[PDB]
Amino acid sequence: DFNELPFQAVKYIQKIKPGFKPQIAFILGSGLGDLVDQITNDTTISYADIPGFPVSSVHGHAGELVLGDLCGVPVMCMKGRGHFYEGKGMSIMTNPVRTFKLMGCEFLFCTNAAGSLRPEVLPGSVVMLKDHINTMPGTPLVGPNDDRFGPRFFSLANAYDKDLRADMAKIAQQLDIPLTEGVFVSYPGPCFETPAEIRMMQIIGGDVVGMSVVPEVLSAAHCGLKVIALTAITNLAEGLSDVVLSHEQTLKFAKVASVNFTKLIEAFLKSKA
Amino acid sequence: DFNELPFQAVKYIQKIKPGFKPQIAFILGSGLGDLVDQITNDTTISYADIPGFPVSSVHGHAGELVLGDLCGVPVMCMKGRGHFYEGKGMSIMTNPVRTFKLMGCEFLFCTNAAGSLRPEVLPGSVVMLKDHINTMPGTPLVGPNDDRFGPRFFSLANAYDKDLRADMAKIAQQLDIPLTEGVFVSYPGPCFETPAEIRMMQIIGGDVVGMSVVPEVLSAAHCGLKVIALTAITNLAEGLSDVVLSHEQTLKFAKVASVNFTKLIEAFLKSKA
Amino acid sequence: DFNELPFQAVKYIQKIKPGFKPQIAFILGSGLGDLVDQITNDTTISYADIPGFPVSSVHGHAGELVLGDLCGVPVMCMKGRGHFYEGKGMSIMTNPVRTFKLMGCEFLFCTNAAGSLRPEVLPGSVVMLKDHINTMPGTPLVGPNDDRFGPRFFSLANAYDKDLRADMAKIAQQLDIPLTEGVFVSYPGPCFETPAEIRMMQIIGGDVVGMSVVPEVLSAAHCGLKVIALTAITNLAEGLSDVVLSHEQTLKFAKVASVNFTKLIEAFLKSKA
Ligand SMILES: O=c1[nH]c(=O)c2nc[nH]c2[nH]1
Ligand SMILES: O=c1[nH]c(=O)c2nc[nH]c2[nH]1
Ligand SMILES: O=c1[nH]c(=O)c2nc[nH]c2[nH]1
Ligand SMILES: [Cl-]
Ligand SMILES: [Cl-]
Ligand SMILES: [Cl-]
Numbered sequence: 066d067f068n069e070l071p072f073q074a075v076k077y078i079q080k081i082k083p084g085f086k087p088q089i090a091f092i093l094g095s096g097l098g099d100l101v102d103q104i105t106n107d108t109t110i111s112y113a114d115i116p117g118f119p120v121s122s123v124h125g126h127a128g129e130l131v132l133g134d135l136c137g138v139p140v141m142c143m144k145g146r147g148h149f150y151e152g153k154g155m156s157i158m159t160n161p162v163r164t165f166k167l168m169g170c171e172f173l174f175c176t177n178a179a180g181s182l183r184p185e186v187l188p189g190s191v192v193m194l195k196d197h198i199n200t201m202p203g204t205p206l207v208g209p210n211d212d213r214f215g216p217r218f219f220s221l222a223n224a225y226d227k228d229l230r231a232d233m234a235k236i237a238q239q240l241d242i243p244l245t246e247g248v249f250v251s252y253p254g255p256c257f258e259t260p261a262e263i264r265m266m267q268i269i270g271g272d273v274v275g276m277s278v279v280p281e282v283l284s285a286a287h288c289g290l291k292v293i294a295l296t297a298i299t300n301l302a303e304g305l306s307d308v309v310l311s312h313e314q315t316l317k318f319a320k321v322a323s324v325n326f327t328k329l330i331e332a333f334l335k336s337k338a
Numbered sequence: 339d340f341n342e343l344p345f346q347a348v349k350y351i352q353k354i355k356p357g358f359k360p361q362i363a364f365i366l367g368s369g370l371g372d373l374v375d376q377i378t379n380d381t382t383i384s385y386a387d388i389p390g391f392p393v394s395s396v397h398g399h400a401g402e403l404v405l406g407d408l409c410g411v412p413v414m415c416m417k418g419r420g421h422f423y424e425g426k427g428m429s430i431m432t433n434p435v436r437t438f439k440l441m442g443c444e445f446l447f448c449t450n451a452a453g454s455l456r457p458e459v460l461p462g463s464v465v466m467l468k469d470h471i472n473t474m475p476g477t478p479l480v481g482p483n484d485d486r487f488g489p490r491f492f493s494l495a496n497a498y499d500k501d502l503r504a505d506m507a508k509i510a511q512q513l514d515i516p517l518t519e520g521v522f523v524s525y526p527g528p529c530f531e532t533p534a535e536i537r538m539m540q541i542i543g544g545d546v547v548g549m550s551v552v553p554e555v556l557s558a559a560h561c562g563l564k565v566i567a568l569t570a571i572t573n574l575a576e577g578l579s580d581v582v583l584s585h586e587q588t589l590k591f592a593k594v595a596s597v598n599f600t601k602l603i604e605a606f607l608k609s610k611a
Numbered sequence: 612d613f614n615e616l617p618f619q620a621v622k623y624i625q626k627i628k629p630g631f632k633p634q635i636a637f638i639l640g641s642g643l644g645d646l647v648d649q650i651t652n653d654t655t656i657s658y659a660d661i662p663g664f665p666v667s668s669v670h671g672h673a674g675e676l677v678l679g680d681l682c683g684v685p686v687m688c689m690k691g692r693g694h695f696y697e698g699k700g701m702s703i704m705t706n707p708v709r710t711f712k713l714m715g716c717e718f719l720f721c722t723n724a725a726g727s728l729r730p731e732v733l734p735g736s737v738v739m740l741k742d743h744i745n746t747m748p749g750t751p752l753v754g755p756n757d758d759r760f761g762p763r764f765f766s767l768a769n770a771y772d773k774d775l776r777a778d779m780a781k782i783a784q785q786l787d788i789p790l791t792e793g794v795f796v797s798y799p800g801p802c803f804e805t806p807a808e809i810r811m812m813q814i815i816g817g818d819v820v821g822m823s824v825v826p827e828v829l830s831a832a833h834c835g836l837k838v839i840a841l842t843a844i845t846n847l848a849e850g851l852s853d854v855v856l857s858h859e860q861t862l863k864f865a866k867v868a869s870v871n872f873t874k875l876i877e878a879f880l881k882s883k884a
Pocket of ligand 1: 178179180181252254257258274275276299300301302303310315
């Protein structure tokens, strides 16, 4: 029955907001939740009410899907995501991503907060992801394949769509907002990484490290939903500075990064309208 | 009851083909399924009918065990394997390998199709595996130990038997068929690897990358079944060429590689008869 | 109900030994089990009788908790641990560690036997751990967070307490016992590592490799229990010598290492009394 959930999600969403045809899906991580306040003609749906969507174990911290118009683009925005560290496995974002796909989104704009493995890319920066290295155990597609959504095996050669990256690089350049491209390393968490793990990630070629992104990106590649993913850098990774990592610390720099992050998103959306 | 399955498999196989005493076990991966057509005095058993053997989730694509004589050697050939990405865990090949052991095979000849991490080892090549690096989560032997089959802890120093490798290297040299030796890196799949993951695998010392081999090889080391393993290279690994990876692409070069792969297997078997 | 087990463990332990107020917790791995013989005013409790404590699958090899006075310090010593390879997941040491915490221990002294990734650190040596790289799948804290014990996210910057390391380095220097500091790499097991895996671990910056430590250390960091961890080197890691790895081989050098290991522990305890 897990496999049917996106079809039920679609029927539910279509009944709540008849007529609505989203063009772009968003996943809103730390610092970017507030972007939903800018959506007009909006409808908000609790994840508790949408089949297959993640429900947090923390009382009062369940996410919401916001549907509406943003900068001339019809969007469906997940305010909140599920993570591998929640204990529901790597497939925790597969049904939501398939729901974006079936709703007709042309692509997914994934956002998250994370640490920089490069000392010269500082807290408060935004980075555009160009590839990943997965260190979470397994992948979301382990298990029987649902061929309704995609093939048993699939290439990750364009997992972070090349043309969307070129589109956004042009926007950043127009805005004079620095936007490096980096390789994302996933980590299971929910502890932050040790300093030795961070040095390992540098050795194997990582630029950014975090606890999300990979599950939803792999689920998207499987069902052929294009992805662009940008990250708010909230700290240099463990061992690279003397800052104490904590969710409070994360949220501090996520707020900072959100100022330019929002300018990039708005200009990008206006360019797609 | 999972632990008893090989004893039931043996009783079943012995009833279907009384008298048969296999000398060598094979696991036949992509391109090498057709080798079963060369077996004489053959009996074929659907995996569905053998306790503990893997049954695919894909309608009509269940494997078969073929018992008979090949080039003067009594063999038992698994046409098809189970993989970690099927979602039954790392132990999906443990009962079949224990079945080879209890049936009396002197060793296991493992075959698979995979990508080359070395640009100079080209698609259509055959490589002999000499060691592995496991990146799948856990190992097949996680869980209580079945001491009927092997010890709680076990060395992997000769996981790809040294003397069998020397035997096969002599065969390849006699035949003038190039046969490099390589370190195999396992990957969970069922996505292919990203280009950054491939560079990571090069950095850590890999030569070949694929989605099988390790589970059955670790299960074999535990129960003391010797292993020789050869791989058909079906592509350079992701990012090392501009080919699009897909199962169709795999099968294309598996057919090519199978020509020399079969010559090596036949000469090797004649040398053991 | 898993989450309540440490509270039940505490009530049970307090009833069996009313009044007892441990200052330091120990986990006793290979070669160091015998240290419990030196505890006075001792009480011994089978793990079978303590809620949440690990019970081995091997008949007759269940561990025991020993409570008493050692070198002027009230201690609670786990003689035996649970491991990831037992198949109960990464959380197999979480309840025992939380039990140490609730009992009031000021820190945990973790001990284990393991392989050296450095050829110049020889079998029979003792190493003090300063950091780790986890290669086991996931972490003990994957799943809903029990905020009674610690936060959803947590830093590993001081996972091997810096001041305890300085304390012990002074002891080793006073005793003229060599004590290098090393990065520990965890491995799922229960196979030992391949030679290629060992070279990978050297490449990524490891100094010592073993099948425990990480689960209990991460559980301790989550609930804020300070850790000092020392390792008995029982072999150079696979491929670095011609010794055959086996539990028998491990136990051989664990006995050797235990002589200086015990001197270090005794002097360290006297310094804390
Ligand atoms: O895994 C992570 N590592 C970090 O450094 C970080 N910062 C924010 N979020 C993060 N996640
Ligand atoms: O994991 C894999 N990587 C590849 O490049 C490949 N080619 C065939 N089969 C393969 N499996
Ligand atoms: O994973 C391990 N690797 C080893 O070399 C070793 N020696 C003792 N115990 C060990 N565990
Ligand atoms: Cl985030
Ligand atoms: Cl194959
Ligand atoms: Cl130990």
